[PDB]
Amino acid sequence: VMKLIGSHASPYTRKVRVVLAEKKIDYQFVLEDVWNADTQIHQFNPLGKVPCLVMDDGGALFDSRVIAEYADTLSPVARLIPPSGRERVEVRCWEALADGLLDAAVALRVEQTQRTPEQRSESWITRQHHKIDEALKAMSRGLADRTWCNGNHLTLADIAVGCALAYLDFRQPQVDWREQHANLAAFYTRIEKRPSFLETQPQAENLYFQSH
Template structure:
């Protein structure tokens, strides 16, 4: 398999963490979708990463689709139940964590890719509002859990939340989320020591 992506994309990182936890071998192909000579649309018509090229040459895109497929390839470290309410709960955690990422990426694009005179502070503030509301919800939900997002077992929910929190550290440092969300801090400190998170940590640039 080949995974097309960047080192700083949090969606790519989520996929790489899953690959590491599942102990699946793959080739990582770096791609900058912002470059004019990017070839990503040959594999994903939306021009986004991650994109997984499977052994038979077929492609999958969108991190949520990819990680769900990867979990079926090996019995090692099952990250999603096959069905039922627990599976739905884990997918909800992933959805809200990805919502945090969507808002943080939107802020980053507004601040970095748009000319200063065209930036909208109202738009940026709206995205911050989404992040804060999501962090508050996740922190309150964790007060009832002894170890991980959905109980005592490490799942895709924890991977998604961990990647979201660490992306905020990378791109939205001004939030200083740890001081307001102790349950999320506890979880993040636990996740950051896992080899899968250590090996996929993005460069700080």
């Protein structure tokens, strides 16, 4: 059984976990804190980042885009990445847009946890918030009046966007993306109820589902 190294908070890890659930691929979720000085992540991912997927023979796969792509090939349940042409490139670009929103939001989390108050840069903070604001505008423009980001069914584009919006709710709740973008609010209401999203909420890090 493959092992996915990650954390409950990590939105790149969540993207992979959602893909694995949609694809009905069995895996073992292995919790790791990459920010701990005693982390073992570099024994598996040379970049020291999560998610990292480890196979039965010890082979390791990264990053989240590579893992998600690989996972779509492992099962016939759903087709999360179109095989070719225009729809595929669109789905890949949507994933990059969502991942870039995540890159900016995660940069903000790093500015909080990895810098002392005296080291923090207001210009860097502004820059990342500008990226989030503009990424949200593009997501709203791209989705328009449609049910899904691309074509007529859930793809990796929707999964990625869903994880990004959820990550804003979790770490950046002051960004009122729902008020700014009605179509994203509606989109998220539709995607958040999927079992794959319900089972992978970052808020599950607080151990709530271990209570009797």
